[PDB]
Design an enzyme around this catalytic site. Structure first.
Site, PDB file in Angstrom:
ATOM      1  N   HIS A  44       0.848  -1.210   0.000  1.00  0.00           N
ATOM      2  CA  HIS A  44       0.000   0.000   0.000  1.00  0.00           C
ATOM      3  C   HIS A  44       0.878   1.252   0.000  1.00  0.00           C
ATOM      4  O   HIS A  44       0.386   2.287  -0.418  1.00  0.00           O
ATOM      5  CB  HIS A  44      -1.045  -0.035   1.118  1.00  0.00           C
ATOM      6  CG  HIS A  44      -0.588   0.299   2.475  1.00  0.00           C
ATOM      7  ND1 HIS A  44      -0.422   1.632   2.892  1.00  0.00           N
ATOM      8  CD2 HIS A  44      -0.407  -0.506   3.561  1.00  0.00           C
ATOM      9  CE1 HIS A  44      -0.066   1.604   4.169  1.00  0.00           C
ATOM     10  NE2 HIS A  44      -0.035   0.263   4.601  1.00  0.00           N
ATOM     11  N   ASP A  93      -0.803  -7.378   1.707  1.00  0.00           N
ATOM     12  CA  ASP A  93      -0.133  -6.062   1.785  1.00  0.00           C
ATOM     13  C   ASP A  93       1.360  -6.301   1.997  1.00  0.00           C
ATOM     14  O   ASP A  93       1.863  -6.217   3.113  1.00  0.00           O
ATOM     15  CB  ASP A  93      -0.750  -5.229   2.894  1.00  0.00           C
ATOM     16  CG  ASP A  93      -0.348  -3.783   2.837  1.00  0.00           C
ATOM     17  OD1 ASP A  93       0.270  -3.378   1.818  1.00  0.00           O
ATOM     18  OD2 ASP A  93      -0.686  -3.068   3.818  1.00  0.00           O
ATOM     19  N   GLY A 186       2.317   6.568   8.631  1.00  0.00           N
ATOM     20  CA  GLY A 186       3.754   6.690   8.304  1.00  0.00           C
ATOM     21  C   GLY A 186       4.582   5.565   8.892  1.00  0.00           C
ATOM     22  O   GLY A 186       5.749   5.455   8.556  1.00  0.00           O
ATOM     23  N   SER A 188       3.531   2.348   8.292  1.00  0.00           N
ATOM     24  CA  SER A 188       3.239   1.243   7.342  1.00  0.00           C
ATOM     25  C   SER A 188       4.530   0.800   6.661  1.00  0.00           C
ATOM     26  O   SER A 188       5.399   1.647   6.333  1.00  0.00           O
ATOM     27  CB  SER A 188       2.224   1.601   6.303  1.00  0.00           C
ATOM     28  OG  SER A 188       2.542   2.846   5.702  1.00  0.00           O
ATOM     29  N   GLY A 189       4.618  -0.498   6.435  1.00  0.00           N
ATOM     30  CA  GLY A 189       5.733  -1.132   5.723  1.00  0.00           C
ATOM     31  C   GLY A 189       6.868  -1.474   6.653  1.00  0.00           C
ATOM     32  O   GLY A 189       7.689  -2.317   6.269  1.00  0.00           O
TER      33      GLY A 189
HETATM   34  O1  LIG Z   1      -1.126   6.775   6.761  1.00  0.00           O
HETATM   35  C1  LIG Z   1      -0.279   6.224   6.054  1.00  0.00           C
HETATM   36  C2  LIG Z   1      -0.474   4.758   5.764  1.00  0.00           C
HETATM   37  N1  LIG Z   1      -0.877   4.032   7.036  1.00  0.00           N
HETATM   38  C3  LIG Z   1      -2.161   3.660   7.248  1.00  0.00           C
HETATM   39  C4  LIG Z   1      -2.571   2.979   8.367  1.00  0.00           C
HETATM   40  C5  LIG Z   1      -1.635   2.658   9.321  1.00  0.00           C
HETATM   41  C6  LIG Z   1      -1.868   1.959  10.538  1.00  0.00           C
HETATM   42  C7  LIG Z   1      -2.635   2.501  11.571  1.00  0.00           C
HETATM   43  C8  LIG Z   1      -2.839   1.811  12.774  1.00  0.00           C
HETATM   44  C9  LIG Z   1      -2.268   0.547  12.977  1.00  0.00           C
HETATM   45  C10 LIG Z   1      -1.492  -0.020  11.948  1.00  0.00           C
HETATM   46 CL1  LIG Z   1      -0.754  -1.665  12.161  1.00  0.00          CL
HETATM   47  C11 LIG Z   1      -1.295   0.700  10.756  1.00  0.00           C
HETATM   48  C12 LIG Z   1      -0.310   3.046   9.104  1.00  0.00           C
HETATM   49  C13 LIG Z   1       0.060   3.748   7.950  1.00  0.00           C
HETATM   50  O2  LIG Z   1       1.225   4.105   7.725  1.00  0.00           O
HETATM   51  C14 LIG Z   1      -3.923   2.779   8.209  1.00  0.00           C
HETATM   52  O3  LIG Z   1      -4.698   2.155   8.936  1.00  0.00           O
HETATM   53  N2  LIG Z   1      -4.394   3.295   7.076  1.00  0.00           N
HETATM   54  C15 LIG Z   1      -3.249   3.910   6.394  1.00  0.00           C
HETATM   55  N3  LIG Z   1       0.797   6.778   5.434  1.00  0.00           N
HETATM   56  C16 LIG Z   1       1.148   8.070   5.609  1.00  0.00           C
HETATM   57  C17 LIG Z   1       2.475   8.416   5.342  1.00  0.00           C
HETATM   58  C18 LIG Z   1       2.933   9.730   5.502  1.00  0.00           C
HETATM   59  C19 LIG Z   1       2.061  10.727   5.931  1.00  0.00           C
HETATM   60  C20 LIG Z   1       2.483  11.987   6.111  1.00  0.00           C
HETATM   61  N4  LIG Z   1       3.523  12.567   5.516  1.00  0.00           N
HETATM   62  N5  LIG Z   1       3.604  13.827   6.000  1.00  0.00           N
HETATM   63  N6  LIG Z   1       2.610  13.994   6.896  1.00  0.00           N
HETATM   64  N7  LIG Z   1       1.922  12.848   6.959  1.00  0.00           N
HETATM   65  C21 LIG Z   1       0.732  10.389   6.208  1.00  0.00           C
HETATM   66  C22 LIG Z   1       0.274   9.082   6.040  1.00  0.00           C
END
Ligand SMILES: O=C(Cn1c2c(c(-c3cccc(Cl)c3)cc1=O)C(=O)N=C2)Nc1ccc(-c2nnn[nH]2)cc1
Length: 236
Positions: A44, A93, A186, A188-189
């Site tokens: 993702h 994922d 942020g 994730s992965g």
């Molecule tokens: O949100 C994301 C992508 N993500 C998600 C989720 C989760 C997530 C939430 C709770 C528990 C778990 Cl185990 C995972 C992590 C996660 O990383 C999600 O449930 N749905 C999406 N990525 C992300 C990157 C960077 C900025 C950012 N950059 N600058 N400011 N914000 C903003 C979002």
């Protein structure tokens, strides 16, 4: 990471920060070193990534503020997304990044073991989630790599909290009944790292959750042991 604390330099040497450079350079996702030319991360992360040309992999980073215009990074030769991936909440994922060159392993950049043949029924009690993600639902990327210890939950308990999703044997869940510690946006992965017989194993990949660190809403992770055959196939 919600409810976590700062890491120290060298503490999680398989952790990488994956940057996009389009339209500006920023942290996109975490990932884990699993081989000299291989990062394991979440599919993702590549939503709206036009190609591997815009990606940079940084290893040995504690603080995002260490990364400057002369900081070395690995290019990405190939993004291998699982062919069944559709969206984080429906599973698969998982992605491999093939790097353009090999990591020379050092104190700052080390591989994490996959879950080992014969350990399918080990009960992991020492599991940590790490990343530069938000410390609450509406927040910012953190400078310093955070860590939090989180207990694994059964797939049965996890399914009961997510009756609108299909929680499968290809997922693993982790969190506290009363919330307070979790991955967030942020992270994730990145890895869910579990130590067993003083060896770290990459048990999970941070995938999704309902909000962050809510009561009775565990984080959901890709169950890496169920993808070992896929990883070995893609990496060989
Ligand atoms: O949100 C994301 C992508 N993500 C998600 C989720 C989760 C997530 C939430 C709770 C528990 C778990 Cl185990 C995972 C992590 C996660 O990383 C999600 O449930 N749905 C999406 N990525 C992300 C990157 C960077 C900025 C950012 N950059 N600058 N400011 N914000 C903003 C979002």
């Amino acid at each position: 990471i919600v409810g976590g604390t700062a890491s120290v330099r060298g503490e999680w040497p398989w952790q990488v920060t994956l940057h996009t450079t389009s339209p500006t350079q920023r942290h996109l996702c975490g990932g884990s070193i699993i081989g000299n030319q291989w990062i394991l991360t979440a599919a993702h992360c590549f939503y709206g990534v036009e190609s591997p040309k815009i990606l940079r992999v940084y290893s040995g980073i504690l603080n995002q503020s260490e990364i400057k215009e002369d900081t070395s990074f690995f290019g990405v030769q190939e993004i291998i997304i699982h062919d069944q991936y559709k969206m984080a909440e429906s599973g698969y994922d998982i992605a491999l990044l093939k790097l353009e060159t090999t990591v020379n392993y050092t104190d700052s950049q080390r591989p994490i073991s996959l879950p080992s043949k014969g350990d399918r029924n080990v009960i992991y009690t020492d599991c940590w989630v790490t990343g530069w993600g938000y410390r609450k639902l509406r927040d910012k990327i953190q400078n310093t790599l955070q860590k939090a210890k989180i207990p694994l939950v059964t797939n049965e308990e996890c399914q009961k909290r997510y009756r609108g999703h299909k929680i499968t044997h290809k997922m693993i869940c982790a969190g506290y009944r009363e919330g307070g510690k979790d991955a967030c946006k942020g992270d994730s992965g990145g890895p869910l790292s579990c130590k067993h017989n003083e060896v770290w194993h990459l048990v999970g990949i941070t995938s999704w959750g309902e909000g962050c660190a809510q009561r009775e809403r565990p984080g959901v992770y890709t169950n890496v042991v169920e993808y070992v055959d896929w990883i070995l196939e893609k990496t060989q």
